[PDB]
Write an enzyme that holds these catalytic residues in place. Structure first.
Site, short mmCIF file in Angstrom:
data_model
loop_
_atom_site.label_atom_id
_atom_site.label_comp_id
_atom_site.label_asym_id
_atom_site.label_seq_id
_atom_site.Cartn_x
_atom_site.Cartn_y
_atom_site.Cartn_z
N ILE A 127 0.39 -1.25 -0.28
CA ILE A 127 0.10 0.07 0.24
C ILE A 127 0.98 0.80 0.08
O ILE A 127 0.15 2.06 0.41
CB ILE A 127 -0.46 0.28 1.51
CG1 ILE A 127 -0.32 0.03 2.34
CG2 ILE A 127 -2.33 -1.38 1.41
CD1 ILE A 127 -1.48 0.01 3.16
N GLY A 128 2.11 0.75 -0.12
CA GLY A 128 3.44 2.22 0.28
C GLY A 128 4.11 1.23 -0.36
O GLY A 128 4.66 0.44 -0.46
N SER A 129 5.00 2.62 -0.72
CA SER A 129 6.79 1.81 -1.08
C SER A 129 7.43 3.22 -0.71
O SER A 129 7.52 4.67 -0.32
CB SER A 129 7.23 1.50 -2.11
OG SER A 129 6.38 2.11 -3.65
N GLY A 130 8.27 3.72 -1.48
CA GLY A 130 9.59 4.86 -1.55
C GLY A 130 11.23 3.66 -0.97
O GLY A 130 11.24 3.62 0.01
N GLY A 135 11.73 1.05 2.05
CA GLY A 135 11.10 -0.43 1.97
C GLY A 135 9.63 -0.12 1.68
O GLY A 135 9.36 1.06 0.73
N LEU A 136 8.98 -1.04 1.21
CA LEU A 136 7.58 -0.77 0.95
C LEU A 136 6.77 -0.85 2.26
O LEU A 136 6.85 -0.55 3.22
CB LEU A 136 7.18 -2.18 0.15
CG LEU A 136 8.42 -3.11 -0.35
CD1 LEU A 136 7.99 -4.25 -1.10
CD2 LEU A 136 8.11 -1.43 -1.80
N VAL A 137 5.36 -0.85 2.13
CA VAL A 137 4.19 -0.64 3.38
C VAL A 137 3.04 -2.11 3.31
O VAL A 137 2.79 -1.79 1.76
CB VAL A 137 3.21 0.42 3.43
CG1 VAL A 137 2.73 1.02 4.66
CG2 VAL A 137 4.90 1.83 3.87
N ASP A 155 10.14 16.47 6.26
CA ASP A 155 9.17 16.75 4.43
C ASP A 155 7.87 16.66 4.97
O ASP A 155 7.11 15.70 4.80
CB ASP A 155 9.21 15.46 4.38
CG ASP A 155 8.72 14.74 3.02
OD1 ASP A 155 8.40 16.06 2.15
OD2 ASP A 155 8.90 14.25 2.71
#
Length: 245
Positions: free
Chosen positions: A13-16, A19-21, A126
């Site tokens: 459901i997320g990344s960068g 790692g991912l989420v 951020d």
């Protein structure tokens, strides 16, 4: 509070790279968001030192942590799940359905969070709608703590972060909120936005933002950090407006 692997992984459901989420469940009971690392993305010490501080910080407006998985396999952070995703994403869809009395409540949630972080001497390098989460009925919580369209001048140049740099960002986030999730300075270059801000240009006031909300937005955008209100102050100012508004 270390988690062994009592974690069930469901969806990404997320990344960068850091790692991912994943959407998971802890103990087949709690819906959680699991932030894994990668490989050589973060020193073991970096992530350890980061997790400890994050676990040191707690406010009703910051995303809560369930624990950490140092018990091997991709190292990870288990956060509580925010049932409405990230703000930015929520603001974009749902556009046209927000009352000004609702968007400001949102800004106030991130300000309370930020006042807490400020006092705790933490700097959210951020702060932006993309790092805010929506959950328990509109409640906004800041996360990803512990993009020059959000950077104060001192960051542009000297890369001089601080509590005030955050406020500047907070100002942009408010614009983001009130514009119901639009891209600040969309049609512009990084090596171009610096030109405009440096001359006195500021993001236009969104329709849903009242002149009084805009005022504070412009106070977060003062050139000098010292000319900007502390979050502790922003919070009380935002409250007044909200109260009467």
């Amino acid at each position: 509070v270390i988690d062994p692997s009592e974690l069930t992984f469901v969806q990404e459901i997320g990344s960068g790279q850091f790692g991912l989420v994943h959407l998971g469940y802890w103990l087949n009971k709690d819906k959680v968001a699991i932030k894994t690392i990668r490989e050589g993305a973060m020193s073991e010490e970096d992530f350890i030192e980061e997790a400890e501080v994050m676990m040191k910080l707690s406010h009703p407006k910051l995303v809560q942590l369930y624990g950490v998985c140092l018990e091997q396999a991709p190292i990870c952070l288990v956060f509580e799940f925010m049932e409405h995703g990230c703000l930015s994403d929520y603001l974009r869809t749902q556009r046209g359905l927000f009352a000004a009395e609702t968007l400001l409540g949102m800004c106030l949630d991130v300000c309370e969070g930020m006042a807490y972080l400020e006092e705790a001497c933490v700097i959210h390098r951020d702060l932006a709608a993309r790092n805010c989460l929506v959950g328990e009925n509109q409640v906004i919580k800041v996360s990803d703590f512990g993009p020059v369209k959000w950077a104060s001048p001192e960051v542009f140049s000297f890369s001089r972060y601080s509590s005030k740099s955050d406020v500047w960002s907070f100002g942009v986030l408010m614009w983001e909120v009130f514009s119901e999730g639009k891209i600040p300075y969309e049609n512009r270059s990084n090596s171009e936005v610096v030109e405009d801000i440096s001359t006195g240009f500021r993001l236009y006031k969104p329709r849903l933002a009242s002149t009084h909300v805009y005022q504070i937005m412009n106070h977060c955008w003062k050139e000098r950090p010292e000319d900007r209100p502390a979050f502790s102050r922003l919070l009380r100012q935002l409250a007044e407006i909200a109260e009467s508004g």
